[PDB]
Design a protein around this nucleic acid. Sequence first.
DNA 1: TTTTTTTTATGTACTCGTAGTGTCTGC
DNA 2: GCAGACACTACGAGTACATA
Lengths: 325, 261, 261, 258, 319, 386
Amino acid sequence: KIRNLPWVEKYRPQTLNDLISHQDILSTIQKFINEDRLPHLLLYGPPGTGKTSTILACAKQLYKDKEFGSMVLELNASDDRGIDIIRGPILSFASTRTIFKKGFKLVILDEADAMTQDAQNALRRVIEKFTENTRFCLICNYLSKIIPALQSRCTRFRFGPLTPELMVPRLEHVVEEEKVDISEDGMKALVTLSSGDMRRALNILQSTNMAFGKVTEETVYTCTGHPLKSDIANILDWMLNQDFTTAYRNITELKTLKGLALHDILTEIHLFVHRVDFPSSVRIHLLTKMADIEYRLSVGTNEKIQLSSLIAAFQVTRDLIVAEA
Amino acid sequence: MFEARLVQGSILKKVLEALKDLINEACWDISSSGVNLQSMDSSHVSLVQLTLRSEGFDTYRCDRNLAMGVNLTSMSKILKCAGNEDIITLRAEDNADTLALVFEAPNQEKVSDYEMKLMDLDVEQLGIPEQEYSCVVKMPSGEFARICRDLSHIGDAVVISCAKDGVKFSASGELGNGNIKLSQTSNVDKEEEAVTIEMNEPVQLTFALRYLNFFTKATPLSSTVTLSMSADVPLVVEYKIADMGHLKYYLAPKIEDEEGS
Amino acid sequence: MFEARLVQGSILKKVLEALKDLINEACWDISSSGVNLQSMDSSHVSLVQLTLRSEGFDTYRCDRNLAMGVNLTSMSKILKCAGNEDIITLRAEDNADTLALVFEAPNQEKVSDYEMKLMDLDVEQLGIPEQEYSCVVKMPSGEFARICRDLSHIGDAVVISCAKDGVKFSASGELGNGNIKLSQTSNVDKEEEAVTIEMNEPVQLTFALRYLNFFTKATPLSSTVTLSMSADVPLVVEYKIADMGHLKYYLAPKIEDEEGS
Amino acid sequence: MFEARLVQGSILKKVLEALKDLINEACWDISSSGVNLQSMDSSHVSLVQLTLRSEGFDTYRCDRNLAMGVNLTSMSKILKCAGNEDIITLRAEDNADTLALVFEAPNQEKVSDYEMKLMDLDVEQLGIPEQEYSCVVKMPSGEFARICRDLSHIGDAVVISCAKDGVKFSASGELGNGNIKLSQTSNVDKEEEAVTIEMNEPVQLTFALRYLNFFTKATPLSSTVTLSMSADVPLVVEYKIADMGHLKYYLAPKIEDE
Amino acid sequence: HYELPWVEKYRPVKLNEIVGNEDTVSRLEVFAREGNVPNIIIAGPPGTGKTTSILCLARALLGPALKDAMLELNASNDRGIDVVRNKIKMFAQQKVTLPKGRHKIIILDEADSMTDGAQQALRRTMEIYSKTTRFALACNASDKIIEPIQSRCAVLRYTKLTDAQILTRLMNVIEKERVPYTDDGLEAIIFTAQGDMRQALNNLQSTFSGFGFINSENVFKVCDEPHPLLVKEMIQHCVNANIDEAYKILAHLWHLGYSPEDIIGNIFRVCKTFQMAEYLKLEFIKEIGYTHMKIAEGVNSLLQMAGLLARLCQKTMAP
Amino acid sequence: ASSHCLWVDEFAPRHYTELLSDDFTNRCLLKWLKLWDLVVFGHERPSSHEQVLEEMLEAGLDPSQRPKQKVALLCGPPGLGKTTLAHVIARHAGYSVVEMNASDDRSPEVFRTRIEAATQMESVLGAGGKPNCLVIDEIDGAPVAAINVLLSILNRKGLLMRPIICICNDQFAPSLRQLKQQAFLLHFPPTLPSRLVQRLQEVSLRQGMRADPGVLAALCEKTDNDIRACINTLQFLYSRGQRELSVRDVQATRVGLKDQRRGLFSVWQEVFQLPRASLTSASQRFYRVLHAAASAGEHEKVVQGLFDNFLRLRLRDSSLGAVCVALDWLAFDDLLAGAAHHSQSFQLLRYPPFLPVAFHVLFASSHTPRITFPSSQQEAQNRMSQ
DNA sequence: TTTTTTTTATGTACTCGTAGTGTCTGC
DNA sequence: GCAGACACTACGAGTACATA
Ligand SMILES: Nc1ncnc2c1ncn2[C@@H]1O[C@H](COP(=O)(O)OP(=O)(O)OP(O)(O)=S)[C@@H](O)[C@H]1O
Ligand SMILES: Nc1ncnc2c1ncn2[C@@H]1O[C@H](COP(=O)(O)OP(=O)(O)OP(O)(O)=S)[C@@H](O)[C@H]1O
Ligand SMILES: Nc1ncnc2c1ncn2[C@@H]1O[C@H](COP(=O)(O)OP(=O)(O)OP(O)(O)=S)[C@@H](O)[C@H]1O
Ligand SMILES: [Mg+2]
Ligand SMILES: [Mg+2]
Ligand SMILES: [Mg+2]
C-alpha cells in the first residue's frame, strides 16, 4: 500500500543487507548476531550514515514481533534520561528477566552524547554487572561528549561518511521505486551535494522531483540554490584577474542572476584555494580572511559588504602573487 | 461507533488508581467480546492485562473493532472529579480522534462531557503464552496488600516462595530478614480470607517490591486474589471483578547470582 | 477618627487570601453607611467591590470620610498569626499615618497588636454602570469552586455560555473539550443548591481561568453565589456574605477570534 | 543458645515505644536470672535500667551469658507489625551475628519470622547506681503522664519539688506559668490513685520536659509509678510490672537550679 | 546460557592474574595473604584493573564470608547524604564474626560521583569503626575525592599498562581461545588499545569474530587508529608554519567523519602537553579557545578549522 | 591485637606527653579549658598571633565566673591532630568527650537538641560524674542556620555552663564568619618535620622495620606534614615481604601521593614569584603552576587576585606590553565565561585554567611580593547595587 | 605569614522544609 | 459517630556546577 512518508523514512534499511557502505562493520555485527555473542556497541560518526538503522535492523533480526516490546528498551534525546532514569527504569530493565521468551535483552540509548555525565557515570556498573542479561548500544555523533569509562566498556565502530561510489545503487533503487527520471549529471549532483549524507541525498532528490519533475544538474542546483562549479571558477577568475570595480560588477551580476548565497560561495572558494598552487603566506592570509568573512555572516550583517571583503581578500594578494614571480 | 456505559463509576476509578504510576498509557482494544487492554509499564518489566466483558456494562455496542491508545495522566485528571454512584459513558466514533467521557456530578445535577485526544502509537501485540503454572495460590487481597507493604520496610526485593505447605514471603534487607509464612486460613467465618494451594512444584523467585505494591492498589476491585508462579513463566497476580471482568498483573523475576565462594 | 469592630474572626481570615494573589492593595473607604472597597487589578481585568454595612459590626464610629491604602504583602502574614473565632477590631486616627488592628493571640490569653503604614496612592473611582445584565443565574458557593478547579486541568481559558436552560462551562485544550451543563436543581433539601435562571437572553463569552480561580477563593464566606452575564458588560460574581454586606467581582472577557464567513 | 518466649507482646511494644527516641541502642544482657538492659545516653542525661525476670516469660533457656547490642530504630520496626496479645519468641544463638523474633501477630496463622543484625559496641561498664533516696513517693501512671503533657503546653522545663504534702510541678515562660498543687488523694476507691508519702528532707530540682515525656510513655505498662529523687542524685521513676519484672528511668537535673 | 564477552569472561579472579602495576599488585597479594589491610584509594586511567584488584582483594580476604561482610556501592546506587548516615554507618556498626586480621570491607566504587557532603559525612565513620571495618575506593579523577578522605586512606595510583603487560594477558586469552594470529596484528591491537585492557580485549574479540584471523589489515578494518597520533604532527606542522601538511592532516581527519568539536578537542589536548615555547603555547591555546567559541556558537566548517590552522601558523611568524 | 587495628589507631596518643602538635597550641588549649574549672568543678585552683592568645588567657573572667570566649575554634590542614588534641585535652582536664561530627543529621532542630542535651544538664552518675565537653567536628560543613543555633545558645542570657570545642579544616568558610569573632581561635601550624620524623622512626622501630631519617624526611615532605597519611603510607609500604624501606619507593608516585587543596595565597605566590634555587626548567614551572592553580579551586577568586595584584608588582616591562597581553588574557577569560554561559556549551571552561599560568609566564620575578586579598570588584559591585 | 560577597541564562542534581491527607485511638 | 494525633508522599524552595 501507499503511504504519505518522506523518502528518508519510506526508504529505510529495515534489514542489514540494505545498508551500503560499512561492509566490514556490518559483517562483524552480523557475525556477532549469528554466534549470539553481541557485545556492548558504541556507534559513532557523522549524521546520516546509518547508525540508528543498523541497530534497528539488528533489533528486528534478534527479536520477533511478539516479543519486541519486552526485549528492547529504546531511549533517545526526546525522552528524559536523567540519573533517576538510570537508577530506575534502566536498572530495573537490566536487572530483571524477560516475560515471554528467554533471551538477552537490549537497551538502545540513541543520541547518547546528549546525556549528562552523572547519568553516564551511573551507567557504568549497570552495563558491567548485567552483561549476561542485557546489552547496551550507545549512539552518538560526538565521541568527546561520552566519558572514557563508557568508551572503554563498549567496543567502538566508526560509521564514517558514505563514499559517493556506494550511494549510487541505493539512490538508483529509490529512483526505480519512485519512477524518477534522472540523468547521470543529476546523480553526480546528488552525490556531490550530499557529502557523505544519505538523508540529505534523499531530501534533495525528493525536493527536486517535486519541484521540477526531472532530476538533472540544473534542476538540483536550482532547487538547492547551490552555485555551479563553473560559477565558482568564474568568480575566482574575476577575483584574481582584474581590478576591484569590474570584479565587483561581475560577481554582483552573477549573484543577482543566479540567486547565490555567500556561504556556499565561501565554501567552494575555500575548496578552490587549496587546489590552486598559492604561496604559503598568501594561503595563510586567504584562509584567515575567508574564516573572518565566514564568521561575520553568522550575525545580522550586510552581505554586500562581506562580498566586497571577499573580493578585497584576493585583490590584496594579486600584487603579492605577481611580485612573487 | 463505540459506546460503552459503565454501570458503576467506582470500578473505573479503582482500575486507573492502580495503573497511575505504573501504566504509561492505556491501550483500549475494543471488539464485540468486550474491552481489552494489554500494556507494559515504562520500564518494560511489568505487563498489565485487563479484560472487561460486554455483559458487565449497562449498554455496550461496537460496530467495528477499535484500538484507542490514550494518555493515562490525562485520564487521571478527568477521573478524580467522578462520582462513585453514577453511570459513566465511554463514546468514540469510527474515524474520530475524540474519546468522550459522559457522567454525572457528585451533586448529581449536571452532565459532564470530557473529551480526550487519542494517540497514534504503533504498538505490536504481545503474545500471552497462557500456559499452566507450577503454583496457584488463592489469597485475600487485603492480606497480600499488607504483606508486600510490611516487607517494603525491610528490603527492596522479596524472595517469594510457594510449595505444598503454602506461600512464603522473605525479604533480606539492611536491618535483617523478614520471613512471613501463611498457610491454610480457610477455617474462618468469611469466605474471602482463605489460603488455598492448587499446584505442586515449588518455585523460589525474587521480584521487585515497587511493582508488587503497585499491583496491590487493585484491592477494592476483588476481595480475593490469585497468585500464579512457575520456574520459567513470570508471576501472575490475577484479580477477578465480580460482574465486570478480570485483571492480570505480570512481573518478571530479577536476576540473582550465587556466590562463587 | 475611625473605629470598627467585627463579630467573627473568620469574616476577615477567609476573604483576605482571595485578594492576596488577586489585587496588590486594599483601599478601604470609610463612610457613615459603611466601609467600601473598590480595587482594580494591575492588568486592568479584575475589579473587586467589597461593602460592609455599619449595622453588621459590633460597633462602628465614623465622623469624617477617610480613605486608607494598605498593601497585601504585609496584611497576609499577620492574618495567619490571628485566630479564627476571636474578635477583630480596626482603629485609625484622623491625622496619623498608622493603621492599628487589635485582636486576640491564638493562645487566648494576651492582646496582640500590629501596626501597618498607610500607603498614599492617588486613585479614582471607576464607577460601575449598574446596568441590567442579559443573564442572571444563581449557583451554589462550594460547588462553583469545584467547577473552575476542574477546568484548570484542561486549558488556560474557559468559555461561559448562559442560555435559558442553564450555564455551560467549556474549555477546549490540548487534551480535549470539557463541557458541563448545570440545570434544574430546585428539588433539593438544602436551599443553597437551588440552581435557577432569572433572565432570557443568551450570551457566550470567554474569560481567563486564573482570575476565576482567584474569585473562587472567597467561597466559604457565603452559602450561594450569583452570576451575571451580558453582551459587553463584564461578568459579575456576586456573593451575599453573612449579614453585614455583600461582595462583588468583575472580570473582563477575553478576545474573540476572526471567525467571519 | 538463648530463647525467651514473652507471654504477651504488650510487654515489648510499650517498652520500645517508651525508649524509641530516648536511647539509640538496646543492650540486652542475658543471664540465668533474666534479661537486663542497662543503657546510658551519649551526652549522659538519661539512663534506662530494664530488668525482665525469667519467671515472667513462657519459656526461658540460656546456656551462656549473652550481650545483644541492637539498634532501636531497627527493632521498633518489628513491634509495629506485632500483635498486642501475642506470644513473641525472642531467640538467638551463643556466638551469632543475628537476633530472631518469631510471632503470629494478625491471629490469622501468619507465622512471622523477623531477624535483625546485631551491632558490636564498646563495653561501657557501670556497676550499681547508688540508691539512698531521701524522697520516695508513689503515684498513678496515668496522672503522671497527664501532668507532663499539661506542663509541656506552656514551658520547656519543669521544676519538681518534693514536700510533705506532695510533689509540685511548675514552669515559667513567655506564655504563662503552669502550676499544680498535688494533695493527698488517698480517699478514693481506686488503690492506684493514692499518693503514698515516705519522704524526708524536701528538695527542689529542675528537669528537662522532653525527657520526662519520654519516661511517661510507659503509662499502660504498669498501674502505678514510684518517684524517687534527692539532692545531687538523679530522679528515678519506677514502673514495677506485674509478673515479668520492673523498669526504672534515671534523669539528671539541669545545671540552672530553679 | 549466553557466553560472556572476553572482557567479562576473562576477568581475573585472583590477584596474581592482574598484569601491570607490579609493585602495588604484589603488595595487594601480600595484604590478601596475611591481612590487616589499611583503607585504600586506587586511582588511574580506565581499564587499568582497579575494580578487579579491589574485588579480588575482597574475595581473598573474606572468602565464604563475602556475602555478609562486604558492602559494594556504585554510582548506580543512591549513595547520597542519607545513605552515608544511615546505611554505611549502620554497616560499619554491624557485628560480623570474622577470623583474625579480617575486617568488613565497604567498597565504594567510582567515588568521583559522590558529593562533597557525603564525603564529609564519610570521615568520622572511617575513623571510628576502623577496628572492625575497612574501606576500598576506586576512582579515575582523584582530585574529586576530598583531602580528608585521601588522608584517611593509602592512596594508590595506577599508571597506563605498557605494551608487554597487555601483550601477556592477550597471549593468555589467545591460548585460552585458540585464536590464530600474527605479530603485527597483535602490535596493531596494542596500538589501538592505548594502554586500555578493555579496548584490547574488545578489539581482539571483534577482529576474531569478524574475520577469524589477527593481522594488521583485519584489525584496522574494524578498529581505528587513535586520533591524537596524527594531531601531534598536525600541531608540529603548525609550529613550523607548514600550512599545507597541517591542512592535509586536517582534511584527512575531516573526511573520516570527525566533528569539528572532537578535532579541536584533540588539538587542545595535544597543545596542552606539546614540547615548545611557553608563550607560543599560551597564544596557541588562546587561539584554540577563540576558534572553539565560534564552533560552539554555531559556525563549524572546514573553512573555520583551516582559518584556525592559518592563525596558528601566523602566531609563529609574529614574534 | 596487633593484626586487628590500624597503625594510626595503635600509635594514637592517650596521654598529654605524647602529642605531636605544636606545644604552644596544646598549652593554650589546656589553659583555656582550665579557665572553666571555676564554674564547672567548683574549685578555685585547677591543681602577632601568640600575643593575642596570651592576652585572651589573662584578660580575666566575666561577672558570671566564665571565660568571655566560650568556644575554642580549631583550624588547619588535615592530618595534624586537631581531633586528637581536643579529645586528649578534654580527657586530661577531667571532662567527658561528647562527639558531634558530620555524619550526624546537622539539621537545626537536631543541632539544638544535641547541644541542649550536651550542655544544659548534669551527669547521671551524680557526684564523681565526668562533666560533658562538647566537641563539634567538621563545623565548616555545617549549615548557616546550625551556626546561628550555636550562637543563639552561646549568647543566651538557659545559661551556658559547659565548654564547647569546634574543629574545622577551613577557617575562612562563609558559615563561620560570626563564629570567628566570638571564639578562641587556635590556628594549627604544620607539624615539625624533626618531631614527625622521630615519631615515624619510633613507629617503624616498634613494628620491626628499618628506615633512614632521609627516606622518612622524604615521606614527610611528600605527604605535606600529614601524620595520618605518613603512617598509612608506611603501613602499606612495609607489609612483611621486606624490611628496609628504599628512597625510590617513597619517590615513586604510585604510593603515598595525594592531591592537596592549595590555598589562594600559596597559588598567588607560586604564580607571581619564581621558586628559589632540576627544577630550573620553564616547562616544569609551567606544568606546576597550571596543576596548582587547577587544584586550588574557586577560579573566579584566583582571577580576581591576579587582576588586583599584577599591577602592584615591581614590573620590568616599562613598555606596558605585558600588561596589555595580560588584560587581553583577562578579556579572553571573560568572553569564554560569557560564551559558555550563553550557548550552554561548557567545554569552553578548560582554557581559563591557563590564565594563572599566563600570568606566571608574563610576571615571573625573583622578588618577594606582598599579595593582598582581592576586594575591588566586590566593592564595586556592592556600590553599584547600592 | 596577608579573606566578602552577589551578578552569569538553562538544565540537572541534590538536599531540606512544609502541607494536605489516609489512617489509627479514643468517649 | 466525630475530634485529635501519627507518619506518608508530593511539592515548593534554596544552592551548586557544568572542563582535562
Ligand atoms: N547506510 C545507509 N544505507 C541506506 N540508507 C541509509 C544509510 N544511512 C542512512 N540512510 C538513509 O537515511 C535515513 C536516516 O538514517 P539514520 O540511520 O537515521 O542515520 P544516522 O546515522 O542515525 O544519523 P544520526 O546521527 O542519527 S542524525 C534512513 O532512513 C535511510 O533512508
Ligand atoms: N590489569 C589487568 N589485568 C587483566 N585484565 C584486566 C586488567 N585491567 C583490566 N582488565 C580487564 O578489563 C576488565 C575491566 O577492568 P576494570 O577493573 O573493571 O576496569 P577499571 O580498572 O575499574 O577502570 P574503570 O575506571 O572502572 S572504567 C576486567 O574484567 C578484565 O577483563
Ligand atoms: N603523636 C601521634 N603519633 C602517631 N599518630 C598520631 C599522633 N597524633 C595523632 N596521630 C594520628 O594521626 C591522625 C590525626 O588525625 P585526627 O586528629 O583524627 O583528625 P585531624 O588531625 O583533625 O584531621 P582531619 O581534618 O580530621 S582529616 C589520627 O589517625 C591519629 O590517630
Ligand atoms: Mg538517529
Ligand atoms: Mg570500575
Ligand atoms: Mg578530625
